[PDB]
RNA sequence: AGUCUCCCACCAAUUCGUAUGCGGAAAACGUAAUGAGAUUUAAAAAUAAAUCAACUCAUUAAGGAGGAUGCCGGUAUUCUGCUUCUUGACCUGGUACCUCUAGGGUACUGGUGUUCGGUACUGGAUUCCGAUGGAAUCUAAACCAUAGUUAUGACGAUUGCUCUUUCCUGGAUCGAGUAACCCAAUGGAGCUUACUAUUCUUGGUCCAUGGAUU
């Protein structure tokens, strides 16, 4: 933090150079300093989802959507920092490892509807293909 | 201004007034307003609930879901 | 109406008494002001905040309107109010505005320092804020600390008695007045007249002529000594006749029956109004359905 | 172990039934008066006495649904002036009176049993009304009014209106005291002993009070 | 105008991979239906607190098919199925594998044990090398608005509009007003506040009050 190095750096320039202010098309204003805030509708669903305690064994009519969206809610409210729900809901104070990994992800979704045909994945790891209609 | 404890007489007089309006003209089902005013004026004084275990607790008051201050001889609005 | 908010009571402070010649001059100029067409007249008092007020609360105002100017009110039917203005130079000097605001009907303060200006615009119970226009104003008038005290119950006063006295004070008067109307956005302003003799008085057509030349328009200058000064009087009078502008000790209907329009009828020593019991519970509840007034 | 901190689930229900009973009572009275008055145009009964008999004998079912102003008079007003008369220590010799203190007490008093009259207002279709209040809401006064032949229940706003009321003093020439209440600075009152954020405000909307 | 939010570099995934009533890239953003509360409360001061309105809060995935309530195969309403899909919490213990240099990376399987990631470019001029590439030197810039830097001035001549003196979005006359709140400083989308007292103007509602209808 010694100005001697600053003088050594400016030795590659003049004695006392003057710099212009930025052109007005390259300026930006400072945003807020506190972390972002979540919508309330995404807070209530996650809170009620974690507070919940845990005939081909599938029986999943329209409940598949409920499971496949509860998984996303659990992941979001277990990962994001902006999620400030309450004091009790935590990753370990409520069963998050056990849930959606050995309860929902495989026992429920996988065992109801078999994966549909056309398992031709792609030739890409980014979704990219053609959308053309011959004569339509 | 009001003195240290000269205000006690005023408090008790105002309490007397909002108590007296209930046993007067109590044949109208709209004594609930006066009931509510009395209770708001009894909490606002932060005073311990008035001599409860005697009256005001589900007996000798609030005969139904309103406060008609039901009379002796079992008189009631009967709604 | 027509109202004048300043007529100097001849006295320095609570030290010296008043000679009779000054009182006769005051009577003569009061009669002249009545002749010009003024209905309600104030009477000012100038004391500095850094002086003791007498301990005995009865003597906080020696004007004594009820028994000094009885005959003039008898003939001309004039209405006279007392007023006080305090010099504010340095805060942290004691002598709060508790009891001095009790005896009087209007309380005002003129500041002559930076601290005085800061104190007399946000955290006081005054109703008129005045400067001294015959000297240099203490501060450049901030465009925000003056417009944010008008929204309270405070107003500004312009006295033209300095524009007819000397030659050097006219320049200061013009400059300070231009500054005040510029900074205050010209919203709440009233006009008085610090006349020391009948020669210096002017009527409504001869007070607007001067002020219209310093920037202010004509309609606003007419409203200046009109209902605005009436509202100043209303705020001044609703401080010892009511608790918080909610329960007045006033009177009934009929023109000229209010808390400001009625001066003789209210016993100010006891602040009561004993009236004839003419309205009872067994009479028809409308205007004309009952005929007896 | 006797507070029963959960007996307050009827106060909510009582407060909910109150505000639904009052509306129906007011509407009932207004409709009854409006219907009853229109019977006097087809007939010749113009007095407060014979209309009572006529209605109770030709339309008797709705007879028991009228105000009857006198029922509110005998002790609900004339026997509660003594309330204020004792709240301020008012007697014959009033030389011991203390102004600005009675002004303090009256600011925190109850105005259910009292007689009110309008003196000044911004609505010149309302001057002179005299009535007996029954319930003083936040945005209204509700009172009973004695008409020439039939009584009415009138609700009049507080914003932009000045009321007065008199107080008898003694038996010396039948004098009295007179007080007046404003209408724009009445919701900011302290109901009892409180002290409540008394701010400072302008007065430019209170011009009509001294307009003449 | 402001003590206020969001955007003005990218992400196939240590980056809000967030299908959540509907709109929106996002927002201290807008709006629909049902329902409930106000220091006695999820909560405000000690917005509301007679009714309607206002404040706040809770619930509600799209498409398409089937049956019925109502009116002439139809639409508004009501209950039951179906389709939409990129192996995705963090930390950590095991086995198998790897073109990686005793350690790293990948597959299958067990354990409850408030801001932090990677990749990337200065403007201009001159020079050098057997090249859609590489190398060296010098000099300061990137300065850009149909208001653009604290500028928006001094006056005249017609026509509108509101009121009004006499008349015959009707026409001609007599006479007054055209205000209040206020002002750019890099730009935009939002929100929050200030105003129009016979003193510029336009439209509604009232289980507010007074009169006439009836």
Numbering used by the authors:
A (entry chain B): 71 to 124, 138 to 219
B (entry chain K): 3 to 81
C (entry chain J): 1 to 293
D (entry chain D): 68 to 279
Task: Please give me the paper's original passages concerning this structure.
Here, we report a cryo-EM structure of the S. cerevisiae RNase MRP holoenzyme solved to a nominal resolution of 3.0 Å. The resultant map had an overall resolution of 3.0 Å, with the central regions as good as 2.5 Å. The final model included all known components of RNase MRP, except for a peripheral protein Pop3. The proteins are forming a clamp-like structure embedding RNA and protecting most of it from the solvent, consistent with prior biochemical data. RNase MRP RNA forms an essentially single-layered structure dominated by coaxially stacked helical regions. The fold of the C-domain of RNase MRP RNA is remarkably similar to the structurally conserved fold of the C-domains found in RNases P from all domains of life, including yeast RNase P. Pop1, the largest protein component of RNase MRP, forms the main structural brace in the RNP. At the same time, the N-terminal part of Pop1 engages mostly the S-domain RNA, which is different in RNase MRP and RNase P. The N-terminal part of Pop1 undergoes RNA-driven structural remodeling and adopts distinct conformations in the two RNPs. The structures of the S-domains of RNase MRP and RNase P differ (above), and the part of Pop4 that engages the S-domain RNA undergoes RNA-driven structural remodeling: the long alpha helix α3 found in RNase MRP Pop4 is disrupted in RNase P. In RNase MRP, the N-terminal part of α3 is involved in extensive interactions with the L5 RNA loop, stabilizing its structure, whereas in RNase P the corresponding fragment of Pop4 is rotated ~135° and engages stem P9. RNase MRP protein Rmp1 is a core RNase MRP protein involved in extensive interactions with the RNA component, binding primarily to the foundation of the P15 stem, as well as to the J7/9 region and stem P9. Interactions of Rmp1 with the foundation of the P15 stem result in a ~45° change in the stem’s orientation compared to that in RNase P. Rmp1 binds in the vicinity of the catalytic center of the enzyme and is involved in the formation of the substrate binding pocket of RNase MRP (below).
